[PDB]
Design a protein around this ligand. Structure first.
Ligand code: CO
Ligand code: CO
Ligand code: CO
Ligand code: CO
Lengths: 210, 210, 210, 210
């Protein structure tokens, strides 16, 4: 839990996120909870030019390290941390499938049992607001109250977890769910879904096993 | 046929499965028939952290090696082995295209002659049941009676063969067939198919040649 | 133009074909014109296990090297060579997009000016016949009379050129055209096309430049 | 700003463009503003065979280096430079998604806030004209007057920026926007969009921040 070791992980996540195809238009940003604020990726630096020294610390008051510019989307990383105390890492991206569903402003219903990984029977879509604004931050905080991931209308996705590895994994899983929903929707509307009781059993089962 | 050599192959299949794009949401599991039970991948370990020592042995009674947790989906790997005696390896995954067709709960009809590789004129879809349950196991055993691969409703795919290489190959082929069917279905419903007689000739021909 | 040097190229094409995503379900086969027949890939050997010694020679009478099994689809490689004297290499595959269009049994019309690379204002689709048969061979020979590539109904694609590099390039280009057509067709039917006169000018222009 | 250093960058862009999946059918061409004309990729040489010596200089009169053949599409690279004085690099390709939208001859409306990166509330589609002609050049110059990227009907995409890195980045971003639009269009027509005022705020915000 040394800063430089947290800085590397953040960087490895950016690289890996790219490897998985979630980092298109190189618009993602990643952060972790640290001290009284967070460590986040900087604005204006393509992932492959990133070194541990580029990682920016932002305290709990919204004040950042001198001489360093944090991601232009840092504000909702702070909203996520304040909304979900258990969240230790946040991954945001503009993955294509998640984004297309968010353009239709639809939530992703229970078309697959893995939807329980985000905490319930759906992946919500928070209403649109200009990036970097406090109003966008509010919509995000409200959607994450009972879910670990949310689509953001005409924008992309935010997923949070207890560490970077799980957060990355969740984000990747929502992208798959997103592609599954668009694919079936083009054939039939609405898409068949699993019932609320059936999702209740899977949730209980995930609580049991891990 | 030494355990450690079987353990490596299992691992190479996981890696290769990932390379082919079948391992999204890192949800797959692979096993081989061994002694009176099987060797299978463990639960809770991302494929790249896998070493031969992580591979778990489960006997014919459903009892596993002490201190090791087998895949959460092991039960249907055992059902596959007991349903198809000739099966020596099983590959399961949540490949996107196969899954979307399974969400529509449709079987894949004869839109291409390679559909004969699974044993007939279709790839069935077994009804949904909670993962890890005996009821899911039953539906699987019944679908594999006359086919080597089956879709699992709102879940994914199970393919079995005489060795890991062929099982992996079959799984990959069903994914292609799955993508071909979704693509055409979005344009026309129903999708033109080859007749039962025509599939009868290809099957005979595959019996002849190999 | 030594056999072993032709054998390597064939192998590099298989690898590269795979790299481009045309070799799914590992069903492709590649050949070149050699002496009085051709050199072709063997049946039953996954591309990465291929060595120059696995390449099989088939004379003009349809008789192959002793102890070696040529691709199960060799017959139409011979039909292509006898139909188009100028053809020196043939590439066949079951690329997904080309195959989906072939399942709809539609020819690809002039939706893009690069369609002129195959010789006219379309990529035809030859009617279906069991693989490896003389009747399939006839349909292929007839479609290649005025085009360098053709879709094969419920099967895949055959593209021929003056060398392996161009043949591979053409095959790749038809796959792109195929994906472009399916994508637009799902939105609008029929898809807008360029006129015959406009394709006449591009053809003349390609004759001029190269 | 030495020619050989500009030549390498051009080459790295071709490689990277390919890596991103924009270079299908190997039809792209890239140039930079240099002296009184430009440096551009040559015609007839697959990207991996490219060396700095293959890069061709074309002066402001349309006259090129002796013994070297520039891209067959150089003319609109010159039109782009003369239309947008601030443009220092041009990237052209036949990316699949951009091309499909261009086949429908539709402009890409404001379905995502990143559309502001091209300069306004849309990505236009310039009418079709035979490649390499002065009439095609006119349509391009006119579309780039108020935008940095444009689709070209039944053809592909042209994106310009202040350096190769940003031009490549823009091209990649339009491809993502293109895929987002086709995906949603197959489900609903028309696709919901952000208002002109909302795009006005994002533009102002990008002016502010960078
Ligand atoms: Co964002
Ligand atoms: Co499963
Ligand atoms: Co074939
Ligand atoms: Co062009």
């Amino acid at each position: 839990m040394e800063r430089n070791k947290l800085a590397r992980q953040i960087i490895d996540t950016c690289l890996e996120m790219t490897r998985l195809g979630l980092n298109q238009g190189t618009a993602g940003n990643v952060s972790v909870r640290y001290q009284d604020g967070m460590l986040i990726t900087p604005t204006g630096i393509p992932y492959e030019k990133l070194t541990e020294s580029h990682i920016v610390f932002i305290d709990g008051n919204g004040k950042h390290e001198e001489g360093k510019l944090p991601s232009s989307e840092w504000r909702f990383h702070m909203a996520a941390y304040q909304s979900r105390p258990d969240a230790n890492a946040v991954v945001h991206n503009h993955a294509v499938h998640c984004t297309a569903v968010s353009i239709l402003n639809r939530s992703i219903p229970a078309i697959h049992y893995m939807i329980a990984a985000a905490g319930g029977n759906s992946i919500p879509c928070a209403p649109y607001a200009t990036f970097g604004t406090r109003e966008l931050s509010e919509h995000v905080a409200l959607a994450l109250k009972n879910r670990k991931a949310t689509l953001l209308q005409h924008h992309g996705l935010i997923a949070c977890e207890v560490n970077l590895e799980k957060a990355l994994w969740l984000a990747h899983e929502v992208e798959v769910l997103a592609q599954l929903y668009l694919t079936t929707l083009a054939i039939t509307d609405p898409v068949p879904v699993l019932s609320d009781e059936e999702i209740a059993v899977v949730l209980e089962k995930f609580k049991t096993y891990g």
